Design a protein around this ligand. Structure first.
Ligand code: NAG
Lengths: 42, 50
């Protein structure tokens, strides 16, 4: 469970690092499918 | 912010002594224009109560 300004996202793991955007979410948040693989939001 | 030769850029460079690190002219422009969307999270309870 992760709360953003565009809403709250369920099913993703929050990470402190910053990468390039792959799938745009909104309000400065993007998501990607990364490595035992899972969805991450950053 | 060093000696530029007598040039003031304070009105256009961000002001550290304030949040969001934005210029005074940018502050004024942001104040003049009014938006109907203050935020983007309006819950069911907010509309049900009012
Ligand atoms: C112009 O720059 C000086 C420093 O060089 C600063 O003291 C002054 O306040 C600046 N001008 C304005 C209107 O803030």
């Amino acid at each position: 469970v992760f709360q953003t300004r565009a809403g709250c996202l369920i099913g993703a793991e929050h990470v402190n690092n910053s990468y390039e955007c792959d799938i745009p979410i909104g309000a400065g948040i993007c998501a990607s499918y990364q490595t035992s693989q899972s969805i991450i939001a950053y | 912010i060093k000696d530029f030769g007598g040039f003031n850029f304070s009105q256009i460079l961000p002001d550290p002594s304030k949040p969001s690190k934005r210029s005074p002219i940018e502050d004024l422009l942001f104040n003049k224009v009014t938006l109907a969307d203050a935020g983007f999270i309006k819950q069911y309870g907010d509309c049900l109560g009012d």
